[PDB]
Short mmCIF file of C-alpha atoms and ligand atoms in Angstrom, two decimals:
data_model
loop_
_atom_site.label_atom_id
_atom_site.label_comp_id
_atom_site.label_asym_id
_atom_site.label_seq_id
_atom_site.Cartn_x
_atom_site.Cartn_y
_atom_site.Cartn_z
CA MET V 1 -36.34 40.36 36.16
CA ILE V 2 -36.50 43.80 37.87
CA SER V 3 -34.49 44.79 40.91
CA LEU V 4 -34.42 48.00 42.82
CA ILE V 5 -31.17 49.39 44.30
CA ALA V 6 -31.35 51.99 47.05
CA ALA V 7 -29.56 53.57 50.05
CA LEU V 8 -31.84 54.33 53.07
CA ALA V 9 -31.15 56.40 56.22
CA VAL V 10 -33.31 55.95 59.24
CA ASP V 11 -36.99 55.81 58.53
CA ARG V 12 -36.47 54.86 54.98
CA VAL V 13 -35.46 58.44 54.03
CA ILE V 14 -33.78 58.28 50.76
CA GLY V 15 -33.76 61.96 49.67
CA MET V 16 -33.95 65.70 50.34
CA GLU V 17 -33.49 69.06 48.68
CA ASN V 18 -29.78 68.71 48.04
CA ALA V 19 -27.39 65.79 47.99
CA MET V 20 -27.57 63.48 51.02
CA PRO V 21 -25.04 64.62 53.64
CA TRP V 22 -22.95 61.52 53.92
CA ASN V 23 -19.68 60.30 52.48
CA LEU V 24 -20.01 56.62 51.55
CA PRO V 25 -17.59 55.41 48.97
CA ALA V 26 -18.15 51.89 50.18
CA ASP V 27 -21.80 52.27 49.16
CA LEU V 28 -21.05 53.53 45.76
CA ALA V 29 -18.56 50.79 45.16
CA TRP V 30 -21.39 48.20 45.91
CA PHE V 31 -23.76 50.29 43.70
CA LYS V 32 -21.36 49.94 40.81
CA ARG V 33 -20.45 46.34 41.30
CA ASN V 34 -24.15 45.47 41.21
CA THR V 35 -25.16 47.68 38.33
CA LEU V 36 -22.25 47.24 35.97
CA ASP V 37 -23.16 46.03 32.52
CA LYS V 38 -26.96 46.34 33.17
CA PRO V 39 -29.62 48.77 32.15
CA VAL V 40 -30.28 51.60 34.65
CA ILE V 41 -33.69 53.22 35.11
CA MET V 42 -33.89 56.42 37.08
CA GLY V 43 -36.09 59.36 37.30
CA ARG V 44 -35.23 62.86 36.28
CA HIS V 45 -34.35 64.07 39.70
CA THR V 46 -31.94 61.19 40.10
CA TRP V 47 -30.33 61.93 36.82
CA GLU V 48 -29.65 65.40 38.04
CA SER V 49 -27.89 64.37 41.19
CA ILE V 50 -25.74 62.00 39.07
CA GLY V 51 -25.24 64.71 36.27
CA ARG V 52 -23.34 62.46 33.76
CA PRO V 53 -23.96 59.04 32.22
CA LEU V 54 -22.97 56.07 34.32
CA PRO V 55 -20.32 54.24 32.38
CA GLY V 56 -20.57 50.77 31.30
CA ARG V 57 -24.24 50.90 31.85
CA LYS V 58 -27.17 51.60 29.69
CA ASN V 59 -28.79 54.77 31.01
CA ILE V 60 -32.58 55.27 30.65
CA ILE V 61 -34.23 58.35 32.12
CA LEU V 62 -37.88 58.76 32.94
CA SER V 63 -39.30 62.21 32.19
CA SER V 64 -42.61 63.57 30.96
CA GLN V 65 -40.68 66.01 28.84
CA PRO V 66 -38.07 65.73 26.11
CA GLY V 67 -34.67 65.08 27.17
CA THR V 68 -31.74 67.34 27.53
CA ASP V 69 -28.79 65.15 26.67
CA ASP V 70 -28.20 63.08 23.60
CA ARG V 71 -25.96 60.76 25.49
CA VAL V 72 -28.60 58.76 27.35
CA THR V 73 -32.03 57.39 26.82
CA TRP V 74 -35.23 59.20 27.59
CA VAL V 75 -38.58 57.55 28.07
CA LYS V 76 -42.10 58.90 28.94
CA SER V 77 -43.59 55.93 30.71
CA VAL V 78 -42.90 52.88 32.73
CA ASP V 79 -43.64 50.60 29.85
CA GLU V 80 -41.35 52.44 27.56
CA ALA V 81 -38.74 52.27 30.25
CA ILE V 82 -38.72 48.51 30.25
CA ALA V 83 -39.11 47.99 26.51
CA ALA V 84 -36.02 50.14 26.04
CA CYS V 85 -34.15 47.59 28.11
CA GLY V 86 -34.53 44.82 25.50
CA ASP V 87 -34.24 41.21 26.63
CA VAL V 88 -32.07 41.23 29.64
CA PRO V 89 -31.76 39.02 32.66
CA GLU V 90 -31.80 41.85 35.19
CA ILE V 91 -32.93 45.48 35.27
CA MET V 92 -31.90 47.94 37.94
CA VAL V 93 -34.12 50.77 39.22
CA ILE V 94 -31.88 53.33 40.97
CA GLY V 95 -34.12 56.10 42.30
CA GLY V 96 -35.81 58.30 43.22
CA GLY V 97 -38.89 57.99 45.23
CA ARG V 98 -41.54 58.19 42.60
CA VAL V 99 -39.79 55.71 40.41
CA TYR V 100 -39.41 53.22 43.29
CA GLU V 101 -43.11 53.42 44.10
CA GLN V 102 -44.10 52.65 40.59
CA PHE V 103 -41.52 49.80 40.31
CA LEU V 104 -41.65 48.16 43.66
CA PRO V 105 -44.53 46.15 42.41
CA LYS V 106 -42.70 44.61 39.51
CA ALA V 107 -39.58 43.82 41.43
CA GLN V 108 -38.36 40.41 42.32
CA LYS V 109 -35.31 41.49 44.26
CA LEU V 110 -34.05 44.43 46.42
CA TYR V 111 -30.58 45.74 47.00
CA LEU V 112 -30.61 47.84 50.18
CA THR V 113 -27.99 49.66 52.06
CA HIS V 114 -29.21 50.56 55.60
CA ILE V 115 -27.25 53.56 56.74
CA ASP V 116 -27.11 54.58 60.31
CA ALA V 117 -27.85 58.21 59.77
CA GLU V 118 -30.60 60.40 60.80
CA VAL V 119 -31.43 63.00 58.37
CA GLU V 120 -34.52 64.98 57.69
CA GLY V 121 -35.72 64.29 54.32
CA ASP V 122 -38.74 64.57 52.09
CA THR V 123 -38.36 61.34 50.22
CA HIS V 124 -38.85 57.83 51.50
CA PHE V 125 -38.39 54.34 50.24
CA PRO V 126 -41.71 52.71 49.88
CA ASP V 127 -42.87 50.38 52.53
CA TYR V 128 -42.44 46.78 52.12
CA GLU V 129 -43.65 43.69 53.87
CA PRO V 130 -40.77 41.54 54.97
CA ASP V 131 -43.31 38.73 54.97
CA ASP V 132 -42.98 39.01 51.18
CA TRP V 133 -39.24 39.29 51.04
CA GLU V 134 -36.68 36.83 51.99
CA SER V 135 -33.36 38.19 53.15
CA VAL V 136 -30.67 36.27 51.24
CA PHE V 137 -27.64 38.32 52.33
CA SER V 138 -26.62 40.95 54.75
CA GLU V 139 -23.42 42.50 55.96
CA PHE V 140 -22.78 45.43 58.31
CA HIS V 141 -19.77 47.85 58.47
CA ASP V 142 -18.82 50.41 60.96
CA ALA V 143 -18.08 53.94 59.92
CA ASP V 144 -14.45 54.79 59.34
CA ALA V 145 -11.82 57.04 57.83
CA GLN V 146 -13.53 56.82 54.49
CA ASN V 147 -17.20 56.30 55.19
CA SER V 148 -18.95 58.84 57.36
CA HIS V 149 -21.45 56.54 58.94
CA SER V 150 -22.08 52.86 59.70
CA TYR V 151 -23.94 50.90 57.07
CA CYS V 152 -25.14 47.47 56.30
CA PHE V 153 -25.64 45.84 52.99
CA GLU V 154 -28.62 43.65 52.41
CA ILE V 155 -30.31 41.73 49.66
CA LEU V 156 -33.90 40.44 49.67
CA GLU V 157 -35.92 38.28 47.26
CA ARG V 158 -39.53 38.37 46.62
CA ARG V 159 -41.02 35.13 48.05
CA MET X 1 6.68 77.25 47.01
CA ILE X 2 4.60 75.59 49.65
CA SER X 3 0.88 75.72 49.55
CA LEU X 4 -1.74 74.21 51.91
CA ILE X 5 -5.10 73.03 50.45
CA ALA X 6 -8.03 72.42 52.82
CA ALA X 7 -11.79 72.23 53.25
CA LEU X 8 -13.13 73.88 56.37
CA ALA X 9 -16.54 73.44 57.99
CA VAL X 10 -17.75 76.01 60.45
CA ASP X 11 -15.23 77.08 63.05
CA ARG X 12 -12.40 75.59 61.12
CA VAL X 13 -13.38 72.07 61.72
CA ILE X 14 -11.46 69.83 59.46
CA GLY X 15 -11.93 66.44 60.93
CA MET X 16 -13.08 63.75 63.29
CA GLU X 17 -12.75 60.02 63.87
CA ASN X 18 -14.66 59.10 60.74
CA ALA X 19 -14.99 60.75 57.33
CA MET X 20 -16.74 64.10 57.28
CA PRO X 21 -20.54 64.00 56.90
CA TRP X 22 -20.82 65.87 53.62
CA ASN X 23 -20.94 65.08 49.98
CA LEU X 24 -19.04 67.64 47.82
CA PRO X 25 -17.97 66.45 44.43
CA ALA X 26 -17.42 70.09 43.40
CA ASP X 27 -14.87 70.29 46.24
CA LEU X 28 -13.16 67.15 44.97
CA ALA X 29 -12.74 68.51 41.45
CA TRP X 30 -11.27 71.70 42.74
CA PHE X 31 -8.94 69.57 44.76
CA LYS X 32 -7.94 67.52 41.81
CA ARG X 33 -7.53 70.58 39.72
CA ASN X 34 -5.19 72.50 42.09
CA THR X 35 -3.08 69.37 42.85
CA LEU X 36 -2.55 68.18 39.35
CA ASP X 37 1.05 67.46 38.64
CA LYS X 38 2.32 68.45 42.04
CA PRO X 39 3.78 66.54 44.98
CA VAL X 40 1.27 66.07 47.69
CA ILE X 41 2.10 66.01 51.35
CA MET X 42 -0.12 64.38 53.91
CA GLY X 43 -0.25 62.89 57.32
CA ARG X 44 -0.97 59.29 58.02
CA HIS X 45 -4.48 59.84 59.14
CA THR X 46 -5.28 61.64 55.86
CA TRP X 47 -3.56 58.84 53.83
CA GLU X 48 -5.71 56.19 55.40
CA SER X 49 -8.73 58.40 54.67
CA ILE X 50 -7.91 58.59 50.98
CA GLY X 51 -7.03 54.89 50.71
CA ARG X 52 -4.91 54.76 47.62
CA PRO X 53 -2.34 56.88 45.96
CA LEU X 54 -3.74 59.95 44.25
CA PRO X 55 -2.88 59.43 40.60
CA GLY X 56 -0.47 61.45 38.50
CA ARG X 57 1.07 63.09 41.54
CA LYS X 58 3.83 62.30 43.91
CA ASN X 59 2.48 61.01 47.18
CA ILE X 60 4.41 61.63 50.25
CA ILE X 61 3.27 60.39 53.63
CA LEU X 62 4.63 61.44 57.02
CA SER X 63 4.77 58.85 59.73
CA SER X 64 7.08 58.25 62.65
CA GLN X 65 6.89 54.60 61.64
CA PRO X 66 8.03 52.54 58.73
CA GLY X 67 5.95 52.83 55.65
CA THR X 68 3.61 50.05 54.64
CA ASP X 69 2.86 50.67 50.98
CA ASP X 70 5.26 50.52 48.30
CA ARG X 71 3.45 52.84 45.99
CA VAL X 72 3.92 55.96 47.98
CA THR X 73 6.82 57.71 49.62
CA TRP X 74 7.00 57.62 53.50
CA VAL X 75 9.19 60.16 55.37
CA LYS X 76 9.94 60.87 59.09
CA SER X 77 10.41 64.62 59.20
CA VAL X 78 9.01 67.79 57.59
CA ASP X 79 12.46 68.19 56.05
CA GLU X 80 12.68 64.83 54.51
CA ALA X 81 9.26 65.53 53.17
CA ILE X 82 10.29 68.66 51.52
CA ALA X 83 13.46 67.14 50.14
CA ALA X 84 11.63 64.31 48.62
CA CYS X 85 9.61 66.93 46.57
CA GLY X 86 12.60 68.16 44.90
CA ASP X 87 12.82 71.32 42.77
CA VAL X 88 9.20 71.97 41.86
CA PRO X 89 7.26 75.14 41.54
CA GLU X 90 4.52 74.18 44.05
CA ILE X 91 4.19 71.66 46.82
CA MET X 92 0.80 70.75 48.07
CA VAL X 93 0.01 70.01 51.78
CA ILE X 94 -3.32 68.16 51.96
CA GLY X 95 -3.88 67.54 55.70
CA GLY X 96 -4.50 66.73 58.43
CA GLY X 97 -4.40 69.06 61.30
CA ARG X 98 -1.01 68.19 62.79
CA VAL X 99 0.56 68.57 59.32
CA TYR X 100 -1.07 71.83 58.52
CA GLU X 101 0.10 73.21 61.77
CA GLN X 102 3.73 72.41 60.95
CA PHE X 103 3.56 73.76 57.41
CA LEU X 104 1.47 76.80 57.82
CA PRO X 105 4.39 78.93 58.93
CA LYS X 106 6.13 77.95 55.74
CA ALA X 107 3.17 78.42 53.33
CA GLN X 108 3.09 81.21 50.86
CA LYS X 109 -0.45 80.30 49.71
CA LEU X 110 -3.73 78.75 51.07
CA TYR X 111 -6.46 77.16 48.94
CA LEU X 112 -9.48 77.12 51.12
CA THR X 113 -12.95 75.66 50.67
CA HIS X 114 -15.38 77.35 53.19
CA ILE X 115 -18.30 75.01 53.81
CA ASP X 116 -21.56 75.97 55.44
CA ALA X 117 -21.61 72.73 57.29
CA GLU X 118 -21.85 72.82 60.96
CA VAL X 119 -20.20 69.70 62.35
CA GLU X 120 -18.85 68.37 65.60
CA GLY X 121 -15.25 67.57 65.23
CA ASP X 122 -12.05 67.32 66.96
CA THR X 123 -9.59 68.66 64.45
CA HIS X 124 -9.15 72.26 63.36
CA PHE X 125 -7.40 74.18 60.72
CA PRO X 126 -4.69 76.30 62.37
CA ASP X 127 -5.49 79.88 62.92
CA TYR X 128 -4.24 82.45 60.33
CA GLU X 129 -3.88 86.24 60.75
CA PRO X 130 -5.92 87.91 58.09
CA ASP X 131 -3.63 90.89 58.04
CA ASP X 132 -1.09 88.40 56.95
CA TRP X 133 -2.97 87.06 53.92
CA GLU X 134 -4.34 88.58 50.78
CA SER X 135 -7.46 87.24 49.35
CA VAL X 136 -6.80 86.73 45.65
CA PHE X 137 -9.93 84.74 44.65
CA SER X 138 -13.29 83.62 45.96
CA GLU X 139 -16.19 81.87 44.45
CA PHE X 140 -19.38 80.82 46.26
CA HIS X 141 -21.84 78.02 45.47
CA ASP X 142 -25.11 77.05 46.83
CA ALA X 143 -25.85 73.45 47.76
CA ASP X 144 -27.39 71.45 44.98
CA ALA X 145 -28.58 68.04 43.80
CA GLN X 146 -24.93 67.00 43.76
CA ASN X 147 -23.49 69.00 46.61
CA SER X 148 -24.86 68.62 50.10
CA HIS X 149 -23.96 71.95 51.43
CA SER X 150 -23.08 75.40 50.18
CA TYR X 151 -19.49 76.21 49.54
CA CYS X 152 -17.11 78.95 48.81
CA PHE X 153 -13.60 78.52 47.25
CA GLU X 154 -10.92 80.85 48.28
CA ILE X 155 -7.26 81.61 47.51
CA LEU X 156 -4.99 83.64 49.65
CA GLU X 157 -1.51 84.88 49.28
CA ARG X 158 0.83 85.52 52.12
CA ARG X 159 1.80 89.25 52.23
C1 NAP G 1 -36.23 66.42 45.66
O1 NAP G 1 -36.50 65.48 44.59
C2 NAP G 1 -37.94 65.42 44.43
C3 NAP G 1 -38.46 64.38 43.37
O2 NAP G 1 -37.99 63.26 44.24
P1 NAP G 1 -37.99 61.83 43.58
O3 NAP G 1 -37.02 61.09 44.41
O4 NAP G 1 -39.36 61.28 43.43
O5 NAP G 1 -37.32 62.04 42.10
P2 NAP G 1 -37.07 61.01 40.94
O6 NAP G 1 -37.82 59.75 41.07
O7 NAP G 1 -35.63 60.80 40.59
O8 NAP G 1 -37.67 61.96 39.85
C4 NAP G 1 -39.07 61.93 39.52
C5 NAP G 1 -39.20 62.57 38.17
O9 NAP G 1 -39.07 61.46 37.24
C6 NAP G 1 -40.04 61.57 36.22
N1 NAP G 1 -40.96 60.43 36.22
C7 NAP G 1 -41.19 59.48 37.19
N2 NAP G 1 -42.10 58.58 36.85
C8 NAP G 1 -42.48 58.99 35.55
C9 NAP G 1 -43.39 58.47 34.61
N3 NAP G 1 -44.15 57.38 34.86
N4 NAP G 1 -43.52 59.15 33.40
C10 NAP G 1 -42.79 60.24 33.19
N5 NAP G 1 -41.88 60.79 34.02
C11 NAP G 1 -41.77 60.12 35.16
C12 NAP G 1 -40.73 62.93 36.33
O10 NAP G 1 -39.89 63.81 35.59
P3 NAP G 1 -40.45 65.14 34.88
O11 NAP G 1 -40.55 66.04 36.08
O12 NAP G 1 -39.32 65.71 33.95
O13 NAP G 1 -41.83 64.92 34.30
C13 NAP G 1 -40.55 63.17 37.82
O14 NAP G 1 -40.59 64.53 38.15
C14 NAP G 1 -38.53 66.60 45.25
O15 NAP G 1 -38.69 65.85 46.38
C15 NAP G 1 -37.24 67.41 45.60
O16 NAP G 1 -37.37 67.69 46.94
C1 NAP G 2 -8.62 60.61 64.13
O1 NAP G 2 -7.35 61.14 63.63
C2 NAP G 2 -7.20 62.56 63.96
C3 NAP G 2 -5.68 62.76 63.71
O2 NAP G 2 -5.78 64.01 62.91
P1 NAP G 2 -4.69 64.74 62.04
O3 NAP G 2 -5.44 65.70 61.24
O4 NAP G 2 -3.59 65.33 62.86
O5 NAP G 2 -3.97 63.62 61.11
P2 NAP G 2 -2.89 63.82 59.98
O6 NAP G 2 -2.04 65.01 60.20
O7 NAP G 2 -3.35 63.44 58.62
O8 NAP G 2 -2.00 62.66 60.53
C4 NAP G 2 -1.35 62.75 61.81
C5 NAP G 2 -0.19 61.80 61.65
O9 NAP G 2 0.81 62.43 60.80
C6 NAP G 2 2.02 61.75 61.07
N1 NAP G 2 2.98 62.82 61.27
C7 NAP G 2 2.64 64.11 61.20
N2 NAP G 2 3.66 64.94 61.39
C8 NAP G 2 4.74 64.09 61.62
C9 NAP G 2 6.12 64.35 61.90
N3 NAP G 2 6.68 65.58 62.00
N4 NAP G 2 6.92 63.26 62.06
C10 NAP G 2 6.37 62.05 61.96
N5 NAP G 2 5.11 61.72 61.71
C11 NAP G 2 4.34 62.78 61.54
C12 NAP G 2 1.90 60.85 62.30
O10 NAP G 2 2.01 59.46 61.92
P3 NAP G 2 2.43 58.24 62.89
O11 NAP G 2 1.41 58.24 64.00
O12 NAP G 2 2.12 56.87 62.18
O13 NAP G 2 3.82 58.40 63.46
C13 NAP G 2 0.59 61.40 62.88
O14 NAP G 2 -0.10 60.60 63.82
C14 NAP G 2 -7.71 62.37 65.40
O15 NAP G 2 -7.70 63.47 66.20
C15 NAP G 2 -9.04 61.86 64.74
O16 NAP G 2 -9.83 62.71 64.00
C1 MTX G 3 -26.21 60.08 43.63
N1 MTX G 3 -26.28 59.00 42.70
C2 MTX G 3 -27.40 58.04 42.85
C3 MTX G 3 -27.13 57.04 43.91
C4 MTX G 3 -26.06 57.03 44.88
N2 MTX G 3 -25.83 56.14 45.82
C5 MTX G 3 -26.77 55.16 45.80
N3 MTX G 3 -26.46 54.11 46.64
C6 MTX G 3 -27.18 52.98 46.54
N4 MTX G 3 -27.01 51.92 47.23
N5 MTX G 3 -28.22 52.91 45.61
C7 MTX G 3 -28.58 53.91 44.79
N6 MTX G 3 -29.54 53.78 43.97
C8 MTX G 3 -27.79 55.12 44.91
N7 MTX G 3 -28.01 56.04 43.94
C9 MTX G 3 -25.11 58.53 42.24
C10 MTX G 3 -24.09 59.47 42.22
C11 MTX G 3 -22.88 59.07 41.78
C12 MTX G 3 -22.66 57.77 41.35
C13 MTX G 3 -21.40 57.34 40.91
O1 MTX G 3 -20.43 58.09 40.94
N8 MTX G 3 -21.22 56.07 40.67
C14 MTX G 3 -19.98 55.62 40.06
C15 MTX G 3 -18.99 55.16 41.11
C16 MTX G 3 -17.81 56.18 40.83
C17 MTX G 3 -17.02 56.29 42.10
O2 MTX G 3 -16.91 55.08 42.57
O3 MTX G 3 -16.68 57.42 42.59
C18 MTX G 3 -20.22 54.44 39.31
O4 MTX G 3 -19.48 54.30 38.27
O5 MTX G 3 -21.13 53.71 39.75
C19 MTX G 3 -23.68 56.89 41.39
C20 MTX G 3 -24.95 57.27 41.85
C1 MTX G 4 -10.68 62.26 51.82
N1 MTX G 4 -9.67 63.02 51.11
C2 MTX G 4 -8.90 64.24 51.60
C3 MTX G 4 -9.47 65.57 51.14
C4 MTX G 4 -10.74 65.81 50.60
N2 MTX G 4 -11.22 66.96 50.21
C5 MTX G 4 -10.39 67.98 50.38
N3 MTX G 4 -10.89 69.19 49.90
C6 MTX G 4 -10.09 70.27 49.91
N4 MTX G 4 -10.44 71.42 49.50
N5 MTX G 4 -8.78 70.12 50.40
C7 MTX G 4 -8.28 68.97 50.88
N6 MTX G 4 -7.12 68.88 51.32
C8 MTX G 4 -9.18 67.83 50.86
N7 MTX G 4 -8.67 66.64 51.27
C9 MTX G 4 -9.67 62.78 49.82
C10 MTX G 4 -10.51 61.68 49.49
C11 MTX G 4 -10.58 61.35 48.15
C12 MTX G 4 -9.84 62.11 47.21
C13 MTX G 4 -9.83 61.88 45.77
O1 MTX G 4 -10.25 60.86 45.23
N8 MTX G 4 -9.47 62.86 44.98
C14 MTX G 4 -9.26 62.59 43.55
C15 MTX G 4 -10.38 63.30 42.80
C16 MTX G 4 -11.31 62.20 42.12
C17 MTX G 4 -12.70 62.78 41.76
O2 MTX G 4 -12.57 63.87 41.10
O3 MTX G 4 -13.77 62.19 42.08
C18 MTX G 4 -8.06 63.24 42.97
O4 MTX G 4 -7.97 63.00 41.79
O5 MTX G 4 -7.26 63.97 43.59
C19 MTX G 4 -9.06 63.17 47.65
C20 MTX G 4 -8.96 63.53 48.97
#
């Protein structure tokens, strides 16, 4: 199955011009723990903000143009994206906006991180009807010496 | 010799209750690069903010109270701190504010990261007389897909 993994500030903002202005090592740790050993699908802008292959994971990048790095996999469509995954139990879609909108429909599960931050951005998570998703986990955490803002982990399953 | 390394937002703000609201991997690599194979000196607050010993370097934490982690060196005075460094060509002071303030009068060099981040914080970098320091390097960078805010690296030598 397909799962999307994302980190949302208030109002589902998930992106802007430059890197999101927050320091959340706790989020990244969760990102890793839930993506390790799986295939990762991301769009070109997300690949740029990451700038190097994610280890231990199979990296597939969506782009209408030829790729720029021999290290990872490049695909030109959603269907090639999947097919490149092979037979696998779970597929993780990691950003950005455009990719999420195309994939939200195929997804069975969501991995959200609701961050208590208000930032002005140009990219939003797509809307989703809770009355379609069943929350199967959730856990909040206050900000601290390591994480710049409060955040809460949450997992939902398509009903 | 003693050197202080620090990242400053506008008005010398260096800290607050929780981790700073920025995301600057480029700053981190500069930090790793200028600290490599050197003893690092930090205050308790900064140790808790890092969360683990920095690898391949000697960690020395200042605290008026008994240490609580066997993997790092705890000391009770600036002197003990220096003595634990031993005979080395460069000692690095990584924060926070109370620490910097003690060691600035002894520093021969400052490795500054000037960030175009305007944040609300309680802690400041001490004040330094410019006619006291020589600027021996600077390198600016615009914010990007990886770095949340613009930044400029600097290196000054005490005259
Ligand atoms: C920020 O980042 C932005 C883009 O935000 P975002 O979060 O939407 O970025 P994103 O999802 O990480 O990147 C979208 C990019 O992925 C590629 N892509 C997505 N779906 C595709 C498909 N079906 N076939 C081929 N390529 C596909 C395109 O790359 P190509 O541009 O290389 O065609 C597209 O420009 C602007 O908002 C800027 O402000
Ligand atoms: C939070 O934390 C901020 C504290 O900021 P900060 O930048 O000052 O933290 P920092 O320098 O990283 O840490 C301050 C701590 O350093 C330790 N320390 C520093 N100099 C010492 C000395 N000469 N002898 C013994 N212990 C010494 C103390 O530990 P102990 O308190 O454990 O004695 C002190 O509370 C607040 O204002 C806020 O942002
Ligand atoms: C910016 N980008 C995309 C990114 C970041 N946080 C997110 N957070 C969540 N929850 N979901 C996402 N899809 C998301 N995507 C990144 C950038 C760096 C790393 C990264 O360093 N990850 C390392 C973790 C390394 C480290 O822990 O410093 C890893 O091995 O997963 C991941 C994603
Ligand atoms: C929060 N804190 C203190 C910190 C952060 N940035 C600074 N930036 C500058 N310029 N100077 C400092 N003293 C400074 N201190 C940290 C937090 C994490 C790491 C850290 O992981 N550094 C790794 C770098 C790992 C990486 O490259 O991702 C190291 O190897 O030293 C360091 C300092």
